Amino acid sequence: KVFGRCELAAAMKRHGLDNYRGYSLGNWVCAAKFESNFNTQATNRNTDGSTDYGILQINSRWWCNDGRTPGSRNLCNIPCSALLSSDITASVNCAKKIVSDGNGMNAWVAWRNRCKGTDVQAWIRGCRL
Ligand SMILES: [Cl-]
Ligand SMILES: [Cl-]
Ligand SMILES: [Cl-]
Ligand SMILES: [Cl-]
Ligand code: NA
């Protein structure tokens, strides 16, 4: 599913990401834009053999099980395929664990490099929320 920007903003708000660990909703929308282009089916294999999954590109090294990341953890207790759903619930619940882990949103390389310190409210401008 390729979400519309305000569609995703409303789903993220509904599932509790607005000001979660102090990150306003535009941070999460911007992160998803640059991580997945709002595509829930996005996947990208990392050089070390882990894979990032879904709208927030959650990594199999720590967070989900894909059966092909040796020595990895599954700290969100989910199959990585659950992160590819049209239903963003599993991605949002797991993102909450990731952003609580000590580095905040710097866990998302695209957020650090492309969203951090920018006008992130622009990402929710025009959305009825
Ligand atoms: Cl939309
Ligand atoms: Cl915002
Ligand atoms: Cl594995
Ligand atoms: Cl923080
Ligand atoms: Na894993």
mmCIF file of C-alpha atoms and ligand atoms in Angstrom:
data_model
loop_
_atom_site.group_PDB
_atom_site.id
_atom_site.type_symbol
_atom_site.label_atom_id
_atom_site.label_comp_id
_atom_site.label_asym_id
_atom_site.label_seq_id
_atom_site.Cartn_x
_atom_site.Cartn_y
_atom_site.Cartn_z
ATOM 1 C CA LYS A 1 0.000 0.000 0.000
ATOM 2 C CA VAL A 2 1.412 3.412 -0.945
ATOM 3 C CA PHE A 3 -0.083 5.765 1.663
ATOM 4 C CA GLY A 4 -1.026 9.308 0.972
ATOM 5 C CA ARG A 5 0.790 11.741 3.222
ATOM 6 C CA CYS A 6 -2.264 12.877 5.269
ATOM 7 C CA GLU A 7 -3.583 9.264 5.248
ATOM 8 C CA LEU A 8 -0.363 8.163 6.970
ATOM 9 C CA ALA A 9 -0.339 11.138 9.345
ATOM 10 C CA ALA A 10 -3.846 10.185 10.551
ATOM 11 C CA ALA A 11 -2.928 6.470 11.007
ATOM 12 C CA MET A 12 0.264 7.391 12.890
ATOM 13 C CA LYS A 13 -1.704 9.815 15.096
ATOM 14 C CA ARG A 14 -4.385 7.235 15.780
ATOM 15 C CA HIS A 15 -1.747 4.688 16.927
ATOM 16 C CA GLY A 16 -0.091 7.171 19.273
ATOM 17 C CA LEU A 17 3.060 8.369 17.540
ATOM 18 C CA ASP A 18 2.304 12.168 17.785
ATOM 19 C CA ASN A 19 4.768 13.495 20.526
ATOM 20 C CA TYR A 20 5.772 9.883 21.376
ATOM 21 C CA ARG A 21 9.114 10.231 23.283
ATOM 22 C CA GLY A 22 8.686 13.901 22.446
ATOM 23 C CA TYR A 23 8.754 13.558 18.616
ATOM 24 C CA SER A 24 5.970 15.559 16.937
ATOM 25 C CA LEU A 25 3.973 13.835 14.180
ATOM 26 C CA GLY A 26 5.792 15.584 11.288
ATOM 27 C CA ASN A 27 9.047 13.870 12.376
ATOM 28 C CA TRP A 28 7.441 10.436 11.875
ATOM 29 C CA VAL A 29 5.817 11.407 8.535
ATOM 30 C CA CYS A 30 9.092 12.811 7.228
ATOM 31 C CA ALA A 31 10.986 9.690 8.393
ATOM 32 C CA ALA A 32 8.526 7.452 6.543
ATOM 33 C CA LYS A 33 8.763 9.551 3.396
ATOM 34 C CA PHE A 34 12.514 9.163 3.133
ATOM 35 C CA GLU A 35 12.718 5.590 4.528
ATOM 36 C CA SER A 36 9.996 3.978 2.311
ATOM 37 C CA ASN A 37 8.352 6.693 0.118
ATOM 38 C CA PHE A 38 5.214 5.784 2.174
ATOM 39 C CA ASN A 39 5.228 2.260 0.643
ATOM 40 C CA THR A 40 4.354 -0.459 3.234
ATOM 41 C CA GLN A 41 5.927 -3.107 0.954
ATOM 42 C CA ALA A 42 9.399 -1.454 0.851
ATOM 43 C CA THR A 43 12.349 -3.740 1.620
ATOM 44 C CA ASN A 44 16.084 -3.075 1.431
ATOM 45 C CA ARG A 45 18.917 -5.478 2.140
ATOM 46 C CA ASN A 46 21.828 -4.112 4.189
ATOM 47 C CA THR A 47 25.494 -5.010 3.450
ATOM 48 C CA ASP A 48 25.757 -7.067 6.673
ATOM 49 C CA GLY A 49 22.833 -9.262 5.469
ATOM 50 C CA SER A 50 20.083 -7.802 7.625
ATOM 51 C CA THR A 51 17.022 -6.331 5.856
ATOM 52 C CA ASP A 52 14.876 -3.262 6.571
ATOM 53 C CA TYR A 53 11.119 -3.739 6.295
ATOM 54 C CA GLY A 54 8.077 -1.600 5.724
ATOM 55 C CA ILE A 55 7.039 2.065 6.003
ATOM 56 C CA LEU A 56 9.697 2.776 8.701
ATOM 57 C CA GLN A 57 12.379 0.368 7.383
ATOM 58 C CA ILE A 58 12.714 -1.596 10.630
ATOM 59 C CA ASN A 59 15.821 -3.734 10.729
ATOM 60 C CA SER A 60 15.935 -7.524 11.223
ATOM 61 C CA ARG A 61 19.302 -7.361 13.126
ATOM 62 C CA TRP A 62 17.416 -6.348 16.302
ATOM 63 C CA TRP A 63 13.719 -5.899 15.876
ATOM 64 C CA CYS A 64 11.931 -8.645 13.842
ATOM 65 C CA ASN A 65 12.530 -12.221 12.697
ATOM 66 C CA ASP A 66 13.061 -12.966 8.981
ATOM 67 C CA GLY A 67 14.873 -16.337 9.429
ATOM 68 C CA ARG A 68 17.942 -15.185 7.422
ATOM 69 C CA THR A 69 19.798 -12.736 9.695
ATOM 70 C CA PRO A 70 22.208 -14.990 11.637
ATOM 71 C CA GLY A 71 22.857 -14.034 15.256
ATOM 72 C CA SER A 72 20.055 -11.459 15.180
ATOM 73 C CA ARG A 73 17.383 -10.546 17.778
ATOM 74 C CA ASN A 74 13.610 -10.162 17.411
ATOM 75 C CA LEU A 75 12.927 -7.532 20.164
ATOM 76 C CA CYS A 76 9.453 -6.561 18.748
ATOM 77 C CA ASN A 77 8.491 -10.337 18.782
ATOM 78 C CA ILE A 78 7.075 -10.253 15.216
ATOM 79 C CA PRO A 79 7.886 -11.781 11.855
ATOM 80 C CA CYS A 80 9.414 -9.091 9.651
ATOM 81 C CA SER A 81 6.641 -9.733 7.071
ATOM 82 C CA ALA A 82 4.143 -8.215 9.590
ATOM 83 C CA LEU A 83 5.917 -4.908 8.994
ATOM 84 C CA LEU A 84 4.829 -5.052 5.270
ATOM 85 C CA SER A 85 1.128 -5.020 6.028
ATOM 86 C CA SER A 86 -1.305 -2.376 4.701
ATOM 87 C CA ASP A 87 -2.252 -2.125 8.482
ATOM 88 C CA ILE A 88 0.591 -0.072 10.113
ATOM 89 C CA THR A 89 -0.113 -1.309 13.694
ATOM 90 C CA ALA A 90 2.873 -3.670 13.936
ATOM 91 C CA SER A 91 5.298 -1.111 12.415
ATOM 92 C CA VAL A 92 4.103 1.602 14.881
ATOM 93 C CA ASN A 93 4.268 -0.638 17.968
ATOM 94 C CA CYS A 94 7.778 -1.700 17.054
ATOM 95 C CA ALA A 95 8.858 1.899 16.223
ATOM 96 C CA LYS A 96 7.802 2.820 19.790
ATOM 97 C CA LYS A 97 10.291 0.248 21.181
ATOM 98 C CA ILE A 98 13.047 1.462 18.779
ATOM 99 C CA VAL A 99 12.679 5.175 19.660
ATOM 100 C CA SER A 100 12.731 4.380 23.386
ATOM 101 C CA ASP A 101 16.086 2.463 23.060
ATOM 102 C CA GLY A 102 18.416 5.473 23.897
ATOM 103 C CA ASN A 103 19.183 7.269 20.559
ATOM 104 C CA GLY A 104 15.695 8.502 19.870
ATOM 105 C CA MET A 105 14.874 8.962 16.200
ATOM 106 C CA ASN A 106 18.593 8.871 15.295
ATOM 107 C CA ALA A 107 17.889 5.078 14.942
ATOM 108 C CA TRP A 108 16.495 6.088 11.480
ATOM 109 C CA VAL A 109 19.394 7.188 9.345
ATOM 110 C CA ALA A 110 17.097 9.019 6.888
ATOM 111 C CA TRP A 111 15.507 10.937 9.770
ATOM 112 C CA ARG A 112 18.911 12.023 11.113
ATOM 113 C CA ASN A 113 20.185 13.044 7.628
ATOM 114 C CA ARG A 114 17.070 14.459 5.973
ATOM 115 C CA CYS A 115 14.442 15.420 8.694
ATOM 116 C CA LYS A 116 16.342 16.347 11.920
ATOM 117 C CA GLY A 117 16.442 20.179 12.434
ATOM 118 C CA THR A 118 14.127 20.868 9.400
ATOM 119 C CA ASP A 119 10.514 22.317 9.435
ATOM 120 C CA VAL A 120 8.933 18.941 10.032
ATOM 121 C CA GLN A 121 5.385 20.467 10.689
ATOM 122 C CA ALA A 122 5.345 21.067 6.924
ATOM 123 C CA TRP A 123 4.783 17.276 6.586
ATOM 124 C CA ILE A 124 1.313 17.565 8.335
ATOM 125 C CA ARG A 125 0.324 20.917 6.875
ATOM 126 C CA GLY A 126 -3.099 20.630 5.203
ATOM 127 C CA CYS A 127 -3.984 17.319 7.041
ATOM 128 C CA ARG A 128 -7.246 17.248 9.111
ATOM 129 C CA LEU A 129 -5.925 15.648 12.322
HETATM 130 CL CL CL B 1 -3.677 11.633 1.728
HETATM 131 CL CL CL B 2 5.062 18.288 13.537
HETATM 132 CL CL CL B 3 17.285 -14.919 11.705
HETATM 133 CL CL CL B 4 15.197 11.974 22.164
HETATM 134 NA NA NA B 5 16.040 -10.794 13.644
#
